[PDB]
A paper describes a structure:
To provide a molecular basis for designing better drugs targeting polymerases, [name] fever virus DNA Polymerase X ([name]) was used as a model for the study. As the simplest DNA polymerase identified to date, [name] belongs to the polymerase X family and is constituted of 174 amino acids. In this chemical reaction, metal-ion A (MeA) is a catalytic ion and decreases the pKa of 3′-OH, facilitating its attack on the α-phosphate of the incoming dNTP, and metal-ion B (MeB) stabilizes the dNTP-DNA-polymerase complex and increases the electrophilicity of the phosphorus center. To clearly understand the phosphodiester-bond-formation mechanism and the metal-ion catalysis of polymerases, we designed modified dNTP substrates with a chiral α-phosphorus center (α-P center) using a single selenium atom, without affecting the overall and local structures, to explore the absolute configuration inversion and probe the mechanisms of the metal ion–oxygen interactions.
[name], generated on the DNA-I by incorporating ddNTP without 3′-OH, failed to attack the incoming dNTP (dGTP, dGTPαSe-I, or dGTPαSe-II), thereby forming the substrate complex (the substrate–primer-template–polymerase complex: nat-dG_sub, dGSe-I_sub, or dGSe-II_sub), resulting in the before-reaction state (without the bond formation) retaining the absolute configuration of dGTPαSe. In crystallization trials, [name]-I (generated form 5′-CAGGATCCT-3′ with ddTTP, without 3′-OH) and [name]-II (generated form 5′-CTGGATCCA-3′ with ddATP, without 3′-OH) could not be extended by attacking dGTP or dGTPαSe diastereomers in the crystallization conditions, which allowed the dNTPs to just bind and retain their absolute configuration. Firstly, dGTPαSe diastereomers were synthesized and separated by reversed-phase-HPLC as peak 1 (dGTPαSe-I, eluted first on HPLC) and peak 2 (dGTPαSe-II, eluted later), and their absolute configurations on the α-P center were determined as Rp and Sp, respectively, by X-ray crystallography. Further, when we compared the substrate structures containing native dGTP and dGTPαSe-I, we only found the Se-density difference in the electron map, which indicated the Rp configuration on the Se-modified α-P center, determining the absolute configuration of dGTPαSe-I (Rp diastereomer). As two metal ions occupied the MeA and MeB sites, and they coordinated with the Rp atom in the dGSe-I_sub structure, the electron density on the Rp position was reduced. The distance (in the dGSe-I_sub complex) between the Rp Se atom and MeA (or MeB) was 2.3 Å (or 2.6 Å), while the corresponding one (in native dGTP complex) was 2.0 Å (or 2.1 Å), confirming the interaction between the Se atom and the metal ions. Furthermore, we found that on the phosphonoselenoate group, the P-Se bond length was 1.9 Å (single bond), while the P-O bond length was 1.6 Å (double bond).
Author numbering:
A (entry chain A): 1 to 21, 26 to 174
B (entry chain B): -1 to 174
Amino acid sequence: MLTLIQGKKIVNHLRSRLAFELIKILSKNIVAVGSLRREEKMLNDVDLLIIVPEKKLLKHVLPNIRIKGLSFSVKVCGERKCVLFIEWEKKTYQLDLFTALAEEKPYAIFHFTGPVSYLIRIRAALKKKNYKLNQYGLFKNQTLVPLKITTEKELIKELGFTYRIPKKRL
Amino acid sequence: GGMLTLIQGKKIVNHLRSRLAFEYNGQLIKILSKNIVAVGSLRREEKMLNDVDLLIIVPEKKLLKHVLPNIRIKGLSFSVKVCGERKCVLFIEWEKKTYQLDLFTALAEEKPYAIFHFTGPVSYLIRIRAALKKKNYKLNQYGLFKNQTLVPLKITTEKELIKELGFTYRIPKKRL
DNA sequence: CTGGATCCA
DNA sequence: CTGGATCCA
Ligand SMILES: Nc1nc2c(ncn2[C@H]2C[C@H](O)[C@@H](CO[P@@](=O)([SeH])OP(=O)(O)OP(=O)(O)O)O2)c(=O)[nH]1
Ligand SMILES: Nc1nc2c(ncn2[C@H]2C[C@H](O)[C@@H](CO[P@@](=O)([SeH])OP(=O)(O)OP(=O)(O)O)O2)c(=O)[nH]1
Ligand SMILES: [Mn+2]
Ligand SMILES: [Mn+2]
Ligand SMILES: [Mn+2]
Ligand SMILES: [Mn+2]
């Protein structure tokens, strides 16, 4: 376990130091998610989402992730979930990395921000409008629903739900 | 697990044909041997097998929640590695030796598709499926599908399925 | 080629 | 609710 402040600190050390095979990952594209983003006093792990600017790269980003400076082991890894165990200040913490292509970023932030309870209510509701929501996009009947949106707040509003901040979602 | 000869596998099966059963809210229910079908390397009559693969035909959709989850082999000592409604992998003690026993299930209307799938070998299944992929079809242990939709075929048996799909019917021992 | 059990996210 | 990684069938 870690405190919110520990998580926040850890993130910052990482914001500069992410990269992949030798290509750096802009901090602009790293987004803290999960219990950290919701600003819980206590966290179990740090959950980071990474925005990939093009579809080809997913085969390479998490599979060839590079944290310049840090000691760590990889539990499991694929193109969309890589779970790392980092040695931080003589202690071991879990670091979960996820990816989203550019056009997915809001859908993903919304999904990975959580909490789960909130996601279930939201998702349950959308089934009866024939819609399907997830981390990738919004879909009607096995088809992508193109929304003229950039951010999470815009996604949440456009979907037709009340925009609440992460700390006040459950 | 450990290796067995075709004859060992065949023998094992027979001991099992009469001894399979299941609980279903506390009624202890036997599984007809008529509904047990040897599959995998045994059915292909390879000289040597790695495990015995048995397919079980379930006559009613409700029962799947109960059959493999509450499987009963009357007489045998065994441990369960993993188990769900469709794959249950068992390790049986047979004659002071441990062998793997993989149980699968198919509903009635699935039986040919399942037999075909589980009969294998894998290499053969890939060629076959690749070809059907190119006509915009999808083959499964469950059925045949075009564009996420079931393709109803006038068929009963595996040979009829294989033929109807539009492939040359070869017997299990000569598939690869 | 295609999917199942497990155990996560 | 909805889907991912792994190790299998
Ligand atoms: N749809 C869906 N999404 C899920 C689920 N579990 C986690 N997630 C997402 C939402 C979470 O904010 C995010 C991180 O998951 P996690 O297991 Se790490 O829980 P989290 O909310 O961060 O709290 P903490 O890590 O336990 O402190 O992943 C889930 O079961 N269903
Ligand atoms: N489509 C598809 N089917 C597969 C696959 N692996 C096993 N199967 C099916 C076909 C096999 O006949 C059956 C059992 O597989 P298994 O790994 Se246990 O080997 P099997 O072919 O029985 O011979 P043996 O067990 O090695 O002696 O399950 C697969 O990857 N794709
Ligand atoms: Mn977390
Ligand atoms: Mn996590
Ligand atoms: Mn086998
Ligand atoms: Mn097997």
